[PDB]
Amino acid sequence: TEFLKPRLVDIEQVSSTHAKVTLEPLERGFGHTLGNALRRILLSSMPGCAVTEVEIDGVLHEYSTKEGVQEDILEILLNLKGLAVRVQGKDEVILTLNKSGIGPVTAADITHDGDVEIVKPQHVICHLTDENASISMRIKVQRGRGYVPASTRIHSEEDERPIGRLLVDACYSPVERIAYNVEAARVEQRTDLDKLVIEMETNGTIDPEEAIRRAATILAEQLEAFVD
Amino acid sequence: TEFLKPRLVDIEQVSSTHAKVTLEPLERGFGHTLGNALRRILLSSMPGCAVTEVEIDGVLHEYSTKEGVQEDILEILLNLKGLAVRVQGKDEVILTLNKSGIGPVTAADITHDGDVEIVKPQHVICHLTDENASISMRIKVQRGRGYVPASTRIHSEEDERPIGRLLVDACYSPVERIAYNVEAARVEQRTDLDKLVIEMETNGTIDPEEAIRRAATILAEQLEAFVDLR
Amino acid sequence: KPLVGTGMERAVAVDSGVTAVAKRGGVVQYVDASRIVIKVNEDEMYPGEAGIDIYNLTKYTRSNQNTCINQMPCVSLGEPVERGDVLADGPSTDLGELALGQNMRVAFMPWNGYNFEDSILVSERVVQEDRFTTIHIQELACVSRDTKLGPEEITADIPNVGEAALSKLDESGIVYIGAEVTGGDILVGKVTPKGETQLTPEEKLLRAIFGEKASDVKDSSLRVPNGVSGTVIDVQVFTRDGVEKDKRA
Amino acid sequence: MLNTCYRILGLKPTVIFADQIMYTGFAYAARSGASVGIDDMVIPEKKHEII
Amino acid sequence: ARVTVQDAVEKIGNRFDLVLVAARRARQMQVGGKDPLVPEENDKTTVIALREIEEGLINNQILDVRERQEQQEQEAAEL
Amino acid sequence: QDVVLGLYYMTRDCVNAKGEGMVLTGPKEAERLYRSGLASLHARVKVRIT
Amino acid sequence: EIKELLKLGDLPTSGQIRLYDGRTGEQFERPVTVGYMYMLKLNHLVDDKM
Question: CATH topology for B1-47+173-230?
């Protein structure tokens, strides 16, 4: 056993949301092994919070029309999918959004809960065109991990699904995009080594580095069954 | 955090070479995550023992011909590459092979060392045609990992260069073929949750359960870099 | 063997002459890497002689393209053999059928442009099996000629040489059979007469600094071609009738 | 695309764009697993009629 | 400058007179041992010259200004 | 060769497929559904692109 | 005759099998033609050509 472990070299933090990572020198063939195995957990298995249900007043379904509002109800739901939310204490919070007059309805118009932080308050949710018009909705955020769409939830849960409740595709894993590349590690004698280069794309609730650390933890927790 | 860890259930050992290992319960997505990541370490990173050096008496090189033997020396070396051997204590053991008279020289004709087990004794090495003919050789088995060729080894060390020493491509990694499946678990009410069947097809030496234990160890030791160092 | 043949493989391998074939059928009395002796059946066997055919098989030998030629016995010790059956396989033949290369599991699908323009992606496993590994026997000659200044010597006694070169040579100055050699290594120690050449003063100083001054006889030893490298399988010595012989010869 | 990009943006953008097109093109070609079987060579049922 | 020499060509004009200026400045740092204006960043004298042209520090006219400065300063120590 | 065939396979659409007529935040959530294994590269979808 | 022989070895008529990427583990999107082609090492070897 000539166990050669890499070590975390440089973390190029371009933003708090996008950050690059270089790793060297990794042993040949473990370039893609950790790169993919991590990418998979970070896409589907990562925990975070996301809009699951919405319920707007004057709205019986997502296809219907509200007067004095630019976006179709579907396009409003799309904006709520991409609403960054961090629930600190509870696993489920239903937030209330009431607002009137001419203005782009931002994420700051939602009533903040004692233990709920809206990460981008300037995030657009709806545009009010008429001053006479007003919008009201109840936005349910739940916690899970990875990516659970409305189509893969109607399949699993055939429990209570009542008319008017608008389902929204949940982006719980703070990870938006993630990509690992490998070229080639040159050492002294070894030249068939590879250097893993992953570019994770987060939203802001979770740090790039943090998310990776958690994904490696979940993987090592699975290795507890296999003793060593 | 609903951290749901699998456990080793059952190891269906159909043969000493081929053995199935079932793994459940796995939370959705972890079946293929461990499946492939393990398959990769089990192909390439597994340590095993392999014939590295041979030294036959009356043989100056591997291309020559020995009298009273059907095989050319190359074909004998080939047979020793694939000789199943397990060294228990040391990393390097040099075994002696002397044998005479009419018969197929099997692996059992090698003098077994106190801490050396020859896994397939009926393994063919050479065919003696003449009764008058006798063969004598010194087979060095060393332990390593992966595949170390004789061409990679004839261009690095070479401090002592004794004429009459035949180097052989080392087939160290014990795993020949490996393929993971994913199947229904039928546990409590989980439904989603399933299991992971790792079908391993190895030589004699490395034991299925033992090997999977080592492969999980190597993965966790490489993860030290992503858990400890941030 | 080829898995997907036409059938002509066996006609080609046998008619090619490279396969040793049974002149008369019978039982094989003696089998060996070097030769096969077959005792013939009474009906075909001639009444005069013993009726035992000898086939001394041509062994790892050079081709015109510096490739390998070996005949391996493809029948076992004391096996019943019919007339016109293949007793021994040639370099590119297997149980009598023509075997030019190797058949393998091939998948037709692109791969990250590593099969761009008919570029080919092969597993390490094919290289590990040494199955597409080829033998290249190579012939290099060392000639002692006669210059104006005198006849050339072949001895291990060579001016300007480290012990690394002279190590694999014997007393006569010829490499041992079986000795692995790489570019630079001397195979046959040849030394040539040279007139007492005008040493430049700087050279005369440098030769006087170490003391080792060049002798009348220079040097022209046969050494392994630059970059090429293998194992010495054979050495053949042709001395003229009346010239002093090496002890190796 | 690269001719458009050359006239709009410049040399640098094209060289990087051309590369990225190459990278993704190879990689998604590999994903596709596109292949060539004997059944992929469909003959019309009406060939013997036409002849 | 590193791959792309388009920015350096846009600054002088001619692809040919660019090579002539870059080589002149390359030869100054190669023999004369002039100090670079751009951070070295561990590149060859060729790329330093291109960087300096891209930024608009080295030019056919600027090089003649600076040659006349060093030349005529020594001519004034004489006269 | 491969490169054209790859971009061709990517861009071309197909009837429904996995996840037809969905609605995605951006080009990165499209890569999220494809690598997550919930949409074919050939699904007709509305996506926000700038 | 070839397809008939394929059924004798319990292999598909198509002579295309579902392959999986060794790096990733996930499947290629479509069945891929795989089988045994007798290939040949030509004398144009790179050690001589370089």
Answer: Gyrase A; domain 2 (3.30.1360)
Tell me the two tokens of residue A6.
Answer: 């890499």
Q: Is G22 on the interface with C (CB under 8 A)?
A: no
User: For residue A82, which of A203, A177, A210 has the smallest C-alpha distance?
Assistant: A203
* C-alpha–C-alpha distance, residues B148 and B131, integer Å: 37
The CA distance from F1 to F13, in Å, is 20
Residues A78, A55 contacting (CB under 8 angstroms): no
Query: With helix as H, strand as E and coil as C, how does C159-184 read?
Result: CCCCHHHHCCECCCCEECCCCEEECC
3-state secondary structure string, A55-80?
EECCCCCCCCCCCCECCCHHHHHHHH
Instruction: Provide the CA E75 distance to its chain's centre, in angstroms.
Output: 23
- Taking the C-alpha atoms of residue C11 and residue A52, their distance in angstroms, rounded to an integer, is 75
Of D33, D38, D39, the CB nearest to G29: D33
User: Among B4, B15, B40, B10, which Cα is nearest to B180's?
Assistant: B40
Q: Domain E1-79 has what CATH class?
A: alpha beta
CB contact under 8 A, D25 and F3: yes
* C101/G35 touch (CB, cutoff 8 Å), yes or no: no
Resolution, Å (one decimal)? 3.8
CA dist., res. B97 & res. B56, Å (int):
9
- Cα separation, C184 vs C168, in Å, equals 12
Q: How far apart are CA G21 and CA D31, in angstroms?
A: 9
Beta-carbon contacts of residue F13 (< 8 Å; ≥ 6 apart): F42, F43, F44
Contact between residue A220 and residue B5 where contact means Cβ atoms under 8 Å apart: no
Measure the CA–CA gap between C129 and G46, rounded to whole angstroms.
20
Contact A171, A140 (CB under 8 A): no
Residues of G in contact with A32 (CB under 8 A): 23-24
Phi-psi region of A107 (alpha: psi -120 to 50; beta: other; left: phi over 0): alpha
Q: Which of A3, A29, A221 sits opposite B221 (nearest CB)?
A: A3
Q: Which structural technique was applied?
A: X-ray
Count of residues making up chain C: 249
The separation between the first and the last C-alpha atoms of chain F, rounded to the nearest angstrom, is 31
Does domain A1-47+173-228 match CATH 3.90.550.10? no
**CA dist., res. B63 & res. B166, Å (int):** 10
Query: ∠ at Cα B116 (B110, B119), nearest 5°?
Result: 75
Please give the CATH topology (third level) of the domain spanning C133-243: OB fold (Dihydrolipoamide Acetyltransferase, E2P) (2.40.50)
CATH 3.40.1550.10 given to domain B48-172: no
Q: Tokens standing for B54?
A: 């041979």
Put simply, the answer to whether G30 touches D39 (Cβ < 8 Å) is no
Residues A41 and A46: their CA atoms lie apart, in Å, by 6
Q: What is the CATH number of domain C18-92?
A: 2.40.50.100
